[PDB]
């Protein structure tokens, strides 16, 4: 089906959701895997193989899948129609064995490293913002407020990057921390990165961030 904003979408026999991005530009058009249902049920079950559960998709509403959760022999629903469910998309980044090791009441959903969570958020924020931006660039707003969602996505993006940056600084990897600092947008975040560098006791990184902030301030003045 088409998304709630006309993007082409399809659900595979592997039970994965695929979306076509950049279709307006043939040298940039590309297929993106945006959600694996099996990985969600695996986490939801506490890392277990409840193959008795199946997902029946209905439609895509912005970032959320409308679907029926079917149980038993036959992998499709019956009458009278059961009520639908709602589920968010998330990027495929995780590993079962690593998450089991990190994890190690019996069905409790598995706990995840903050690094994976922040990384997945930054990727998801980036993809969502780009798709929304393309929609606005070509077709505009339907309702008059979607720019506010885009602003929220940009805030989430910098926030996720700051956590990853702070991890790199705490590891004293100035090279990786500096490379991450290039990807931050607002000078609020760069100022926070300076404070983070001070807590990490990296005056070299404070210096180089302030060089970047001065360079970007010049670019903002230009």
């Amino acid at each position: 089906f088409f998304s709630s904003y006309g993007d082409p979408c399809i659900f595979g026999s592997d039970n994965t959701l695929l979306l076509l991005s950049k279709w307006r530009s043939p040298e940039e058009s590309k297929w993106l895997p945006i959600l694996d249902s099996n990985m969600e049920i695996w986490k939801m079950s506490g890392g277990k193989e409840t193959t008795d559960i199946h997902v029946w998709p209905l439609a895509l509403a912005y970032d959320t899948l409308n679907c029926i959760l079917v149980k038993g022999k036959h992998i499709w629903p019956e009458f009278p129609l059961p009520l639908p469910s709602e589920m968010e998309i998330r990027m495929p980044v995780f590993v079962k064995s690593k998450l089991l090791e990190e994890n190690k009441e019996e069905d409790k959903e598995i706990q995840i490293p903050v690094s994976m969570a922040a990384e997945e958020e930054y990727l998801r924020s980036k993809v969502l913002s780009e798709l929304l931006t393309d929609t606005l660039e070509n077709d505009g707003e339907m309702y008059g407020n979607e720019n506010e969602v885009l602003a929220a996505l940009n805030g989430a993006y910098d926030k996720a990057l700051l956590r990853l940056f702070a991890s790199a600084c705490s590891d004293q990897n100035v090279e990786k921390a500096l490379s991450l600092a290039h990807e931050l947008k607002q000078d609020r975040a760069l100022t926070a990165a300076v404070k983070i560098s001070e807590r990490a006791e990296l005056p070299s990184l404070v210096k180089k961030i302030n060089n970047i902030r001065e360079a970007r301030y010049e670019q903002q003045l230009k």
Binding site: L162, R163, A166, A200
Partner: protein
């Protein structure tokens, strides 16, 4: 490893009609259970009654101008009026039972609180005139015949005290809220138990004993022991 949750918090951060009804529910529930007559909310009632009048006129104007929004508005106004009706009837019932006590409290020139602080103007009118009606009935019927030593109606000195007053030691159910703003670090009474929630401590003086009132646990407690914390909204009656 380096913490930044506070850096993220400071980076990230850069009266209403809803609230009045919650206060009304609070007042109603506390008034029902407590043994004494609690002080009237003078400001809240003024604002609520004005709002009721305006909403009534709005409903009439829209009616004279889909059905479902009108249904919601009408039944909401019914739900609001019921609470106030119940609350005022309860307060008048308390005034019936403690009339001589309230009059004696007012006559005491050294009293720490005036009767007009405690009661509304309508309640003052009811108390005053009802006392005269009851007084006239017994004065003519019974007391006209008694000798002069026994003609007083509010006698304290007789072999039985003629004035009733609240039972300050009545048992009541309570639920411990803590300070309303979530300012656990600012409340001076709120100490801490070992490896757990904060708590308050109270002394029960007949027994010379102490108890710890943890946040969130329910208790059956004497009224006077918890009166101050109730006045400060640290606890709420169940």
């Amino acid at each position: 490893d380096i913490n930044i949750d506070d850096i993220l918090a400071e980076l990230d951060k850069e009266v209403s009609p809803q609230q009045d009804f919650s206060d009304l529910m609070k007042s109603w529930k506390n008034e029902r259970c407590s043994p004494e007559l609690l002080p009237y909310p003078h400001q809240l009632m003024k604002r609520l009654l004005n709002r009721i009048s305006m909403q009534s006129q709005l409903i009439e104007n829209i009616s004279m101008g889909s059905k479902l929004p009108l249904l919601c508005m009408e039944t909401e106004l019914e739900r609001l009026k019921f609470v106030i009706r119940s609350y005022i009837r309860c307060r008048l019932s308390k005034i019936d039972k403690f009339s001589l006590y309230l009059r004696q409290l007012n006559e005491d020139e050294n009293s720490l609180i005036s009767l007009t602080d405690l009661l509304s103007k309508d309640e003052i009118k009811y108390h005053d005139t009802h006392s005269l009606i009851w007084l006239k009935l017994v004065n003519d019927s019974i007391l006209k015949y008694m000798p002069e030593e026994l003609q007083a109606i509010n006698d304290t000195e007789g072999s039985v005290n003629m004035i009733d007053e609240p039972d300050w030691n009545k048992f009541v159910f309570i639920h411990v809220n803590g300070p309303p703003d979530g300012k656990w670090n600012e409340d001076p009474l709120l100490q801490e138990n070992e490896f757990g929630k904060p708590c308050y401590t109270v002394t029960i003086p007949d027994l010379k004993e102490e108890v710890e009132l943890t946040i969130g646990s329910i208790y059956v407690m004497r009224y006077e022991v918890i009166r101050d914390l109730l006045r400060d909204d640290k606890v709420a009656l169940i």
